[PDB]
Amino acid sequence: KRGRQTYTRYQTLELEKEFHFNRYLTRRRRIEIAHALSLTERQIKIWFQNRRMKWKKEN
DNA sequence: AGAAAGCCATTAGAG
DNA sequence: TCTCTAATGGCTTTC
Ligand code: NI
Numbered sequence: 307k308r309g310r311q312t313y314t315r316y317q318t319l320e321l322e323k324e325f326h327f328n329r330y331l332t333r334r335r336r337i338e339i340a341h342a343l344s345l346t347e348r349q350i351k352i353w354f355q356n357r358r359m360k361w362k363k364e365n
Numbered sequence: 366a367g368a369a370a371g372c373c374a375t376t377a378g379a380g
Numbered sequence: 381t382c383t384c385t386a387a388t389g390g391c392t393t394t395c
Binding site for chain 3: 308309310311312313348349352353356360
């Protein structure tokens with residue numbers, strides 16, 4: 307139908323690692339992480355969005 | 366300015 | 381099936 311990719315343990319970890327420092331990302335930083343983890347800039351953008359949403363409800 | 370990014374409510378797919 | 385979360389739509393805000 308649409309499709310969905312599940313993020314590896316490494317990817318989710320590195321992403322959660324970066325989020326510990328910068329809760330928001332500049333465009334250059336997103337391109338870096340994308341290449342580093344073999345993800346799309348768009349996928350990195352959305353991940354930080356969703357992860358930001360969980361951080362608001364918990365706090 | 367106006368693309369881009371954010372917020373947000375919501376959907377749905379894979380494990 | 382059940383749950384987690386990737387992914388979308390539709391506005392508003394940013395820069
Ligand atoms: Ni405008």
